């Protein structure tokens, strides 16, 4: 059979993030299936040991996979994690497309925390979408896991906390769906951007689907633009209309960070906190999925 790692028999593929494939596989030896990425060696810029380096240095975080094994092997950088539940996106799917205001809410707390935990560790996500969140097995369902730092970055240094600086004309990085304005814009990313992204998240969630999702190109760069135009041209108050006046205050408090500024994490939760008590709702931790 064809293994990696001596241990790990490979399966089907099963999706593709940042520079690599992802692969079912089975812990030859304990039993259990993992998760595999494999990176093609033949490259000048190999990303999965940076990956790696990035997710060994978030394992003391709460909802941060396990790395089991790097390595390389024959034509392929391999990084072996374990295997999560189903994603945000694969959960949402299985709910119809549409969430309540309580597990919009219950995830909205989750994901701040995980965002502020890489923060943290002076790192910014860039990837912030419904697939690159994940719930775990057994008695970890009720843990939101966030996955790939392949498009991650450190923001600022580690002993002097000195942010990046102020840049212009870079590239655009992960989905144009949930990219923040100012990505759109060319403009480096920072931590605000992370947020405002979990913004449009959580927003997507409410709504079933975002106002610039869904539009009418031919081309492909014809229905990039009218993203872009469609997210720019839609003020929040409109997106938010009909919908608790937190995701409002959410975004705007997002889209008006200073481009190094520190995120008042603990007041965008109290927010949705403070909703979810106005509501009535209680931390049961029965979510769509769980009816």
């Given at each position: 059979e064809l293994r990696v790692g001596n241990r790990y028999r490979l399966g089907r593929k099963i999706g593709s993030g940042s520079f690599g494939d992802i692969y079912l596989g089975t812990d030859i030896a304990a039993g259990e299936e993992v998760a595999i990425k494999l990176e093609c060696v033949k490259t000048k810029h190999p990303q999965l040991h940076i990956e790696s380096?990035?997710?060994?240095?978030?394992?003391?975080?709460?909802?941060?996979?396990?790395?089991?094994w790097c390595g390389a092997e024959g034509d392929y950088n391999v990084m072996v994690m374990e295997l999560l539940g189903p994603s945000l996106e694969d959960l949402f799917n299985f709910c119809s497309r549409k969430f309540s205001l309580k597990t919009v809410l219950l995830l909205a707390d989750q994901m701040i925390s995980r965002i502020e935990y890489?923060?943290?560790?002076?790192?910014?996500?860039?990837?912030?979408?419904?697939?690159?969140?994940?719930?775990?097995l057994?008695?970890?369902?009720?843990?939101?896991?966030?996955?790939?730092?392949?498009?991650?970055?450190?923001?600022?240094?580690?002993?002097?906390?000195?942010?990046?600086?102020?840049?212009?004309n870079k590239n655009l990085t992960g989905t144009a769906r949930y990219a923040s304005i100012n990505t759109h814009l060319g403009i480096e990313q920072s931590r605000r951007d992370?947020?405002?992204?979990?913004?449009?998240?959580?927003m997507y969630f409410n709504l079933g689907s975002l106002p610039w999702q869904g539009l009418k190109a031919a081309t492909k760069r014809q229905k990039y633009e009218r993203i872009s135009e469609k997210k720019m041209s839609t003020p929040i108050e409109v997106l938010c209309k009909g919908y608790p006046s937190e995701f409002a205050t959410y975004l705007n408090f997002c889209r008006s960070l200073?481009?190094?500024?520190?995120?008042?994490?603990?007041?965008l939760r109290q927010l949705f906190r403070n909703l979810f008590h106005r509501q009535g709702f209680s931390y049961d931790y029965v979510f769509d999925w769980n009816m």
């Open positions: 380096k990035i997710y060994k240095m978030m394992q003391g975080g709460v909802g941060i996979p396990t790395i089991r890489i923060h943290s560790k002076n790192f910014i996500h860039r990837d912030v979408k419904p697939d690159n969140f994940l719930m775990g057994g008695k970890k369902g009720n843990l939101v896991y966030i996955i790939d730092f392949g498009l991650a970055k450190k923001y600022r240094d580690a002993r002097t906390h000195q942010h990046i600086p102020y840049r212009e992370d947020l405002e992204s979990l913004g449009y998240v959580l200073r481009f190094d500024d520190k995120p008042d994490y603990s007041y």
